[PDB]
Design a protein around this ligand. Sequence first.
Ligand code: HEM
Length: 213
Amino acid sequence: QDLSEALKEATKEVHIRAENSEFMRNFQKGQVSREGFKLVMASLYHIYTALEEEIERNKQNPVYAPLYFPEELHRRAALEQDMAFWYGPHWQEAIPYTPATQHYVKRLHEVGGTHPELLVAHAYTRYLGDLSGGQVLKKIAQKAMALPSSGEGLAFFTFPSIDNPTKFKQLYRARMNTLEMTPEVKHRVTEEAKTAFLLNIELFEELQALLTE
Ligand code: HEM
């Protein structure tokens, strides 16, 4: 079975659970406030910073290199622009770093440092979702919070180097199917992608609790 298919199949159930997290339900209904959106985007700042450090560390390693797409995909610079927008010029010392965020970062550094054959699972889980449900969320966010079509405060959701997300995802899936693959790597990559989904779910549960507290 091709990796791209194995990953879709492995993560389709936990996807359902993630897209139905209370924080995401509320977001999809349009009940997302500046407070909640700041907390999530700050958390993503730390998450993508770690992920993309680890991508940089492993950019020439063949277990990842075919998916090395900084210009098209990487989010840290976008998130920096969003953090300055939402939190102002001293955002670096204002932004929160929640425990669930720390836990996600920790696993990212474990994977990138010790299990880099699994890094594809973490890239898959975040980037392909940003090009899918993230595009739906971006539109809801604009409407709910009165964010301008010019893009300020939603740089994260904007991919100026991708003309067509549908086509890019197809290319990405096909490239995933070029990685060197054995039954062990395939089993473990799919497992790690389920873990990646759970780390996201836990983050959303945490952020919802922080907002409700
Ligand atoms: C309200 C929240 C969300 C909605 C509405 C949403 C919606 C979607 C939709 C319609 C697709 C299919 C795209 C296609 O076939 O090209 C998709 C795929 C994906 N989503 Fe989400 N999603 C949401 C949350 C999540 C979250 C929390 C994650 C992970 C953190 C995630 C990760 C993915 C991934 C990795 C894919 C690609 C699946 C594949 O083709 O193998 N999504 N999502």
